[PDB]
């Protein structure tokens, strides 16, 4: 039941690209985050 709020869409009129970037927390888990600049790994200390 976690796919009801997955297929989303930016309802704003003027906006830039939001590439599905991944981020790992202080344990070891990725998450698809819609953010600019097509990065691949975000090492957040």
């Amino acid at each position: 039941d976690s796919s009801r709020a997955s297929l989303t869409r930016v309802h704003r009129q003027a906006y830039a690209r939001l590439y599905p970037v991944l981020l790992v927390k202080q344990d070891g888990s990725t998450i698809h985050i819609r953010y600019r600049e097509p990065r691949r790994m975000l090492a957040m200390p």
Partner: protein, 217 residues
């Protein structure tokens, strides 16, 4: 009017990983991404590529590629956590890391004298105390470990009636945070059971009415 005091304790475990994705949802995500691309405008990467290539061509007729190559290299070097966890075991059914996609309910097998079925861990309450207190006490004694069973409310779930002297069963659920089960090699038949396995294990009607209020997902 004699009434035998019993109860019940059903465990609720939140899922860790999400359910698998269907092809129609994949096509829907693809078309939504295409619509997002067609609606988006003036991005940082788009400019940093286009105007940079234009400046390169201009100063050559008289960055971005290496950056994305380094990004791809860092993505290929870093290996994510292997989601394959429900297929590499296929034997340790009483483990916490068995199923991590759905909800899991715990039950303990106990063979009595007149009854020989697989009943959910009951909870005997006393008139001198309350009901939720006795329920959580029985849950802590039958678990012999350090767990955090956060109850979602004082209201019950489902009740039954069996006689031979009357009796009654009080169902109580509690959300589990972390799993610090001490000594997983106990002789108690406490197995982490989900939904289909739960419906397949039970047999009588007293347990068939439990799968109607649990989170079927």
């Amino acid at each position: 009017s004699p009434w035998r005091l019993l109860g019940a304790l059903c465990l609720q475990r939140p899922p860790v990983v999400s359910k698998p994705l269907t092809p129609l949802q994949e096509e829907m995500a693809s078309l939504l991404q295409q619509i997002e691309i067609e609606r988006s405008l003036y991005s940082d990467h788009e400019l940093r590529a286009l105007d940079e290539n234009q400046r390169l061509a201009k100063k050559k007729a008289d960055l971005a590629q290496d950056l994305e190559d380094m990004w791809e290299q860092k993505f290929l070097q870093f290996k994510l956590g292997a989601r394959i966890t429900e297929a590499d075991e296929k034997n340790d059914r009483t483990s916490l890391n068995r199923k991590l996609d759905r909800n899991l309910v715990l039950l303990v097998r106990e063979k009595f004298g007149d009854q020989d079925v697989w009943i959910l861990p009951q909870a005997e309450w006393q008139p001198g105390e309350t009901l939720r207190g006795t329920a959580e006490r029985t849950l802590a004694t039958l678990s012999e470990n350090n767990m955090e069973a956060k109850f979602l409310g004082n209201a019950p779930c489902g009740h039954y009636t069996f006689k031979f002297l009357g009796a009654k069963v009080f169902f109580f659920k509690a959300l589990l945070l972390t799993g610090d089960f001490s000594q997983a090699g106990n002789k108690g038949h406490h197995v982490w059971v989900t939904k289909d396995e739960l419906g397949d294990y039970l047999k009588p009607k007293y347990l068939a009415q439990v799968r109607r209020f649990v989170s079927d997902l």
